Amino acid sequence: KMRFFALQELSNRKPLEITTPSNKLSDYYASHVFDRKKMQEYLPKEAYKAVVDATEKGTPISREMADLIANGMKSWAKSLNVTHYTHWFQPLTKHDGFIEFGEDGEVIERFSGKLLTAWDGSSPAFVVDTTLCIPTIFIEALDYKTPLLKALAAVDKAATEVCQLFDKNITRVFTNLGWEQEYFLVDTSLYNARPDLRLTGRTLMGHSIPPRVTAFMKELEIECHKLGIPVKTRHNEVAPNQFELAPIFENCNLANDHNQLVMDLMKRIARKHHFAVLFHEKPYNGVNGSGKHNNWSLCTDTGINLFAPGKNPKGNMLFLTFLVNVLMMVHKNQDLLRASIMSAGNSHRLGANEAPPAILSIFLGSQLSATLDEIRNRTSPFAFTGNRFEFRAAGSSANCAAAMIAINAAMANQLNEFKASVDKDEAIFRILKENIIASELIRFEGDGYSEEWKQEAARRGLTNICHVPEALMHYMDNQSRAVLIGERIFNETELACRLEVELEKYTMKVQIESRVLGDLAINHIVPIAVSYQNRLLENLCRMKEIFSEEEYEVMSADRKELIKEISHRVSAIKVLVRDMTEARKVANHKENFKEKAFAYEETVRPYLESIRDHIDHLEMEIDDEIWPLPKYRELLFT
Amino acid sequence: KMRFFALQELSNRKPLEITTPSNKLSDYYASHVFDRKKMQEYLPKEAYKAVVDATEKGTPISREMADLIANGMKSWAKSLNVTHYTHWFQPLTKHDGFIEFGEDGEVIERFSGKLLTAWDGSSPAFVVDTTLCIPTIFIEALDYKTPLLKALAAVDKAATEVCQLFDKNITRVFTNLGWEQEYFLVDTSLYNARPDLRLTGRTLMGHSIPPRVTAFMKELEIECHKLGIPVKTRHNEVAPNQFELAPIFENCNLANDHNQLVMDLMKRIARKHHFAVLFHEKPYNGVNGSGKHNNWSLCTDTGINLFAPGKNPKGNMLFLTFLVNVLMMVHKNQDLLRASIMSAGNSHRLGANEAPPAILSIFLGSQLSATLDEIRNRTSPFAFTGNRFEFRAAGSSANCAAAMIAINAAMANQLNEFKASVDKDEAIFRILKENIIASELIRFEGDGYSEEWKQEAARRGLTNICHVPEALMHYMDNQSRAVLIGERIFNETELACRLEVELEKYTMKVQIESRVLGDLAINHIVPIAVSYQNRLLENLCRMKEIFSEEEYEVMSADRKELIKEISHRVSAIKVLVRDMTEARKVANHKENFKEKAFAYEETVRPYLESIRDHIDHLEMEIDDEIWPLPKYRELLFT
Amino acid sequence: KHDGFIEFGEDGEVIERFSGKLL
Numbered sequence A, B: 001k002m003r004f005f006a007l008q009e010l011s012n013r014k015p016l017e018i019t020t021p022s023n024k025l026s027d028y029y030a031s032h033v034f035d036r037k038k039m040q041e042y043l044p045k046e047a048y049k050a051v052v053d054a055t056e057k058g059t060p061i062s063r064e065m066a067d068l069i070a071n072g073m074k075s076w077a078k079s080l081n082v083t084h085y086t087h088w089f090q091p092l093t094k095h096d097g098f099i100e101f102g103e104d105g106e107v108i109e110r111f112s113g114k115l116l117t118a119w120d121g122s123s124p125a126f127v128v129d130t131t132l133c134i135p136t137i138f139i140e141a142l143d144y145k146t147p148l149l150k151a152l153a154a155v156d157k158a159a160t161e162v163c164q165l166f167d168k169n170i171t172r173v174f175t176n177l178g179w180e181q182e183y184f185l186v187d188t189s190l191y192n193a194r195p196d197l198r199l200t201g202r203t204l205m206g207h208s209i210p211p212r213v214t215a216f217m218k219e220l221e222i223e224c225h226k227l228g229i230p231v232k233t234r235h236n237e238v239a240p241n242q243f244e245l246a247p248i249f250e251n252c253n254l255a256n257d258h259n260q261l262v263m264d265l266m267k268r269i270a271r272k273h274h275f276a277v278l279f280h281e282k283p284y285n286g287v288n289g290s291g292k293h294n295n296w297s298l299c300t301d302t303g304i305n306l307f308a309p310g311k312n313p314k315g316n317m318l319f320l321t322f323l324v325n326v327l328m329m330v331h332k333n334q335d336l337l338r339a340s341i342m343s344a345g346n347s348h349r350l351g352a353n354e355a356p357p358a359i360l361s362i363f364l365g366s367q368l369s370a371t372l373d374e375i376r377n378r379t380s381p382f383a384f385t386g387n388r389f390e391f392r393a394a395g396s397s398a399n400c401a402a403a404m405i406a407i408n409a410a411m412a413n414q415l416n417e418f419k420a421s422v423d424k425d426e427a428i429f430r431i432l433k434e435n436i437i438a439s440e441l442i443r444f445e446g447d448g449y450s451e452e453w454k455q456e457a458a459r460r461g462l463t464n465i466c467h468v469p470e471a472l473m474h475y476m477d478n479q480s481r482a483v484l485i486g487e488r489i490f491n492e493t494e495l496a497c498r499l500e501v502e503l504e505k506y507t508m509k510v511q512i513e514s515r516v517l518g519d520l521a522i523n524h525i526v527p528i529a530v531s532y533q534n535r536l537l538e539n540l541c542r543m544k545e546i547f548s549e550e551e552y553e554v555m556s557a558d559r560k561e562l563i564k565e566i567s568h569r570v571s572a573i574k575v576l577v578r579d580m581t582e583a584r585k586v587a588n589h590k591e592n593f594k595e596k597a598f599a600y601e602e603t604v605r606p607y608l609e610s611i612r613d614h615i616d617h618l619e620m621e622i623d624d625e626i627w628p629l630p631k632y633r634e635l636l637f638t
Numbered sequence C: 001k002h003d004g005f006i007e008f009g010e011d012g013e014v015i016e017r018f019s020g021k022l023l
C-alpha cells in the first residue's frame, strides 16, 4: 500500500534542469578550491613561498606562517560567501562561524592560523555550500589519512633509493592513483519503500541512460569540477541502474581525498534528484556487484612511469627491476592485500560476476609475460594494464586508502628488501632473475573464476579466504606486521585497534542485516502471507460445501496444496528467525570482540540466506496486488 | 490497482509545445552534423582536402592529419557547447569530457587525433545534447558496420567490373538504401502497468493522428533534420497506434547509420512525451505487426539507377543485365536472406497481416515480367518497385545492415560470377539468356499468403522455413558460406561466431518471454481469478440456503458452471507454467547454444500460446472492475 | 501521409521544393 504510492509517485518525475557555468572549463574548474593558483593570489609574497616549502616535501608550518595563511585563506572563502569552517577528515568511523568578539567589543569574523586536528598542508582546502573544509588528520591514529600518508612516504624513500641504481638523479618517486567508482541508483520513493535497502544498503531479500539520471550526472560532474576533482568519464555498467565514473589519476593521497569527497557529493546531489545512490558492493542479489578499481603507478620526480615498458622492454632495465618487484610484493603479501579490501559488504561481491575471487594473482599477459621468462583481460585481482597496474579486488564502498596503505607499504618493504639484497652495477640482474623465479607461483593468465584455478592455485600455495573474520585476522599475522609495523606505519597498539575496529564493523553490519531481516520477516512478510492464505482458504471453505466431494476433491486439489505450501514457509520462517535471534544472542555474548566476529560469520550469517529463500518463494506465490515490498523487477527497471 | 491509476493518469495529458527553428529548412538542417559543408569551414585548407581524399575512396588518415581534424572537430563541437565525446557504434545488439591536464599544470580541454575504435571516416560525426559522437567500428569483427562495409565494398567492385562491359567508364558503383520505419506507441503510464510489454517489448497475453502524437513527430522530425537524417515522410499505419516514417534514400551505409540512430532519437523523444515507442515486430497479437522495408538500388558514379528500365527496356541492356542478375541472387541465395532477417520477434511477424511468408520470391509484374520472357502488389519478400527493389521481409527492429550484408554480398558474388561466365561483346546475351531461364523458379506475382502457393513453391523447390533456429543455421550452409566467407566478408571463425551470438539472442529472448509469462500468470492473473471466483462462490453459498433445493438448482446452473470453468483454467495454468518452467530447466542444460536454441523453439516456445489461451478466456470471464492488466481495447485506443 | 518539402539539390545542399508533378 506504500510500495504503490511509490510506483505512482514516480509516474511523473520531470528531471531537474541544470546549466553549465561557462562554455570554457578552464573558467570554473577548481573554482571552489584554495589551490596554489589562488594561494599565490591571496597569500602574502612570503606566506605563499612557505605553503610551498612545506608542501615541497619539507615543511614545517610556523604558527606564524599559519595565521599568515589562515587569514589569507578566509579572505578567499569570503569571496564565496562561505561563513563556516570545519576540519574535514575521514576517521575509522562540526561547523564554526568565524564570529568572534574584538577588543573594542564589536563583533568581527576571524580565522586564526591556530586552526591548522592538524591540516594536511598536502590537500587543498575546498568550499562546499558556504563551508570552508580543511582536510585534516584525526589523532595512536584514529583516521585513515595518517596511515596512508606514512605508507605513501615509505614507498617513496624506498623506491627512490632503489631508483638510484639507475639515473643517479631522481630525487623522489610519487604515487599515482586512478580510481573507478561504480554504484547503483534507486528512485528515493522505491528505496524508502524498501526498509532493508535503507538501513542495510542492500536488499536482504527478493526474487530476481534515462533522462532523470543523465541530469543527475549533468550536475554531479559540474559540481565535481568546481571542486577540483577531475572527472573524466561516466557511463552505465553491466547491471540495471548501475553506473561508473572515473577521473584522471592524481598523487594517491589527493586522489583518495578526492574520491572520498565525490562520494559525499554524489549522495547530497542524488537526494536532490530524488534518487538514492547505493554504494554497497552488492545491492541486489543475482546481478553484477559494484566495485572500485585502483589503477596504481609510480611516476618518478624526473618523469618516468616506472611501470611503463615501451619499445624493447628487455632493455628498460629500470622497469624490469620494478615490475618483477611488484610481482614479489603481490606474491609475498597475498593475505595482507586480501585483507585490506575484505568487508561484510564486499564478501557478497568478490568471486563472482566479474569480481575477482579472494585469490591474489597478477596478470602480465603473453607479451610482457614470455618476456619475463627470457630470464588485457579482467577476471583477476591484479593486472598490468599497460604503463600501470589495476587492483580490482577493492570494494565500491571502501575507502581507497586501506587498499593503498597496504599495497604501498607492502611495496615499500619489498623494495627496501630488493635493495639490501642487491648489495653484495651488474648485481641487479642477479637479484632480478632471483626474484622472477621466486614469484612465478603468483602469475596467472586465465578464467580466474574457473574451478580450474580454484585448485590450480591452491596447489601453488596461493591462499584463498572467503570468510571475512578469518581473512581479516591476517592483519596481525607476522608477515603483515613485518610490513605494517616494520615500515613504521603502525605500532603494535595501533595495528591492534585497526584489526579490532575492523572486526568491530563487520560484526555490527552483519548484526543489523540480521536484526532487520528478522523484523521485516515477522512484521511485514508473514502477515501478508497469512492474509493471502485466507483468500485461498475462504475459497475452498465455501467451494468444499457446494460441490460433491468428488468435484471438490479434484477442484481444491492444487489450491489446497499451496495453502500447505504457504503454511509451511510461514512456519519455517517463524522458526529460522527465532533460532537466528538466539544465535545473535549468544554470539553477542562471546567475551571477546575477536570471537564475537567469528560467532556471526559462523552461526548468524548463515540464516540470512536461509530465511530469504523462503520469503522469495512466497513472493512468487502471493498476489502481486499485495506484497509489501517493491519487487526487483521494479527496483531495476520500473 | 495500477491499471486504473493509468487510465486516470492519462485523463489529462497536454501534448507538449514544439517550436520549429526557423522557417527555412536549409537553415537548421544538418545543423548538428560535422559534414564537409562545415569541415571546409573548421578544417585547415589541407586537413580538409584530406578528409575528402579519405572519403574519396582513397585514404588513409595520417595520425597527423587526424589530430589536424580532431582539433577542427572540437572547435566546432564547442559552438554547440558539447563537453563530452564518445565513440558511437552499434555492437552485436562511453562518455569522456575533453578535460586534460596541461604541461603547465593548468587544466585544458583537448581532443587528440589519437581518438580516430577506429572512426568510420565515412559517416560524419554528429552532436547530441552536449555529446559529440564518432561513428566507429568494433575490432574478429564484433560489430555490424565492419561487415556491412566489407559487404558493400565487394558489391561495388564486383558491380563496377560487370558494368565495364558497357560504358567503359564508370569508376565505381554506390549502393542506395531507402528504409521505412514502422512502430507503435503506448502511453508510458499504460505501458509500465503492463510488465510483459516493458521487458519483453511485446504483450505476452491479452484478449483482442491525435494531438499528443502529432506533437511527438513534430519534435521527432525536427531533431532528425537538425541531425542530417532527411526525414521525408510520416503517416500512421494500418493498425491502431502504428505509424511509419521514412527518409530519402542515402548511400546504404549512411542510410543505415541514420536509421540506426533515429531509433535512439525516437526512444528518447518518446519518453519526453509520455509515450513508449514499441519497435517489437509484433507488439499486439491480432493486428498488423511492424516492419522495416529496405528499398535497394545501385547508382554508378556516372549516374544511372542501374535498376531503372525506362522507355524501351530492351535498349537498356545494362538494366536487363543487372535485373536478371539480381533475379539469380534472390533465387540462388534464398535461405541466406531468410536468415538475415529471422528473429524471435520477427517470427511472430512475417507470414501474415501484410508480412511476407518465409518463402523468398521476387515480383516483376506483367510489364518487365512477360517482357523478360522475350528470350505493384505487396505480399512478397522481394518486389521490383520501379527504379529499385523492395525487401519487405526485414523486421521493424532489426539493424538494416544484416539484410544488406546479405543482399549486397550475395549480389556482389552472383555478379562476379556472371563476369566469370561471360568470359568466353555479345556473349553476355548467352549468359543473360541462361540466368533468365535459370532463375524462372524464383519469379512470382500472386497472393503470397495463399495456400495455392504456400505449396506451389514447395514444388518449385523454393524453400520455406519458420523455426528461427533452423532458418538461422543456414548461415553456415556452404552456399551462404560461398558468399559470406567467400567474399572476404567473414572469415571461417567469424561467421561461426555470428551464428552463435545470433542463436544466443533468440534463446535469451524466448526465455525472458517464458520467464515473465510464467510469473505474470501465477503471480498476477491467477490470484485475481480466485478473488473473483470467491465472489461467485459467496453468491451460491448463501443462495444455496435461502432457496428450495428446487430453485437453487435452477438458479445455480450457469454460476456453478463458470465457477467450474474458472477452477478449470487456473488449474490448467498452474500446470503449463510448471511444465514449462521445467522445459526451460532442461533446455537451459543442453551443453551447446545450438542445442539450447532448438531446445526452446521445440519445447519452451510452444507453451507461450498454451498458457495464454487460458488467461485470455479468464479475462473474458472475470469482472472488468478487477483484472490487473490494461486491456487491449485500452492499449489501442482508450 | 505527410511529406516535408525536403529535397536534395544538385549542389548537394538541401532545399524545400514542391513539384507540380504533385497535382
Ligand SMILES: Nc1ncnc2c1ncn2[C@@H]1O[C@H](COP(=O)(O)OP(=O)(O)O)[C@@H](O)[C@H]1O
Residues within 6 Å of the ligand: A176, A177, A178, A179, A180, A233, A244, A246, A247, A248, A249, A293, A295, A296, A297, A387, A388
Ligand atoms: N598512468 C596511470 N596511473 C594511474 N591510473 C591511470 C593511469 N592511466 C590511466 N589510469 C586510470 O585507469 C582508469 C581506467 O578506468 P576505466 O576505463 O573506467 O576502467 P577499465 O580501466 O577497467 O576500462 C582511470 O581511472 C584512469 O585514470
Ligand SMILES: Nc1ncnc2c1ncn2[C@@H]1O[C@H](COP(=O)(O)OP(=O)(O)O)[C@@H](O)[C@H]1O
Residues within 6 Å of the ligand: B176, B177, B178, B179, B180, B233, B244, B246, B247, B248, B249, B293, B295, B296, B297, B305, B387, B388, B390
Ligand atoms: N532509387 C531509390 N533507391 C533507394 N530507395 C528508394 C529509391 N527510390 C525510392 N526509394 C525509397 O522508397 C521508399 C518508399 O517508402 P513508402 O512509400 O513509405 O513505402 P512503400 O515503398 O511501401 O510505398 C522511401 O524510403 C524512398 O526513399
Ligand SMILES: C[S@](=O)(CC[C@H](N)C(=O)O)=NP(=O)(O)O
Residues within 6 Å of the ligand: A180, A182, A237, A238, A244, A288, A289, A290, A291, A292, A293, A353, A354, A355, A356, A378, A392
Ligand atoms: C565491466 S567492469 O570490469 C565490471 C566490474 C564489476 N562491476 C565489479 O564489481 O568489479 N567495470 P569497469 O568498466 O570499470 O572495468
Ligand SMILES: C[S@](=O)(CC[C@H](N)C(=O)O)=NP(=O)(O)O
Residues within 6 Å of the ligand: B180, B182, B237, B238, B244, B288, B289, B290, B291, B292, B293, B353, B354, B355, B356, B378, B392
Ligand atoms: C501498411 S505497409 O505495407 C506495412 C504492412 C505490414 N505492417 C508490414 O510490416 O509489412 N507500410 P508501407 O507504407 O511500407 O507499405
Ligand SMILES: [Cl-]
Residues within 6 Å of the ligand: A519, A520, A523
Ligand atoms: Cl518493523
Ligand SMILES: [Cl-]
Residues within 6 Å of the ligand: A584, A585, A588
Ligand atoms: Cl541483538
Ligand SMILES: [Cl-]
Residues within 6 Å of the ligand: A624, A631, B519, B520, B523, B524
Ligand atoms: Cl512478478
Ligand SMILES: [Cl-]
Residues within 6 Å of the ligand: B584, B585, B588
Ligand atoms: Cl530459467
Ligand SMILES: [Mg+2]
Residues within 6 Å of the ligand: A180, A181, A182, A237, A243, A244, A245
Ligand atoms: Mg565501471
Ligand SMILES: [Mg+2]
Residues within 6 Å of the ligand: A180, A293, A390
Ligand atoms: Mg577498471
Ligand SMILES: [Mg+2]
Residues within 6 Å of the ligand: B180, B181, B182, B237, B243, B244, B245
Ligand atoms: Mg509503413
Ligand SMILES: [Mg+2]
Residues within 6 Å of the ligand: B180, B293, B390
Ligand atoms: Mg514499403
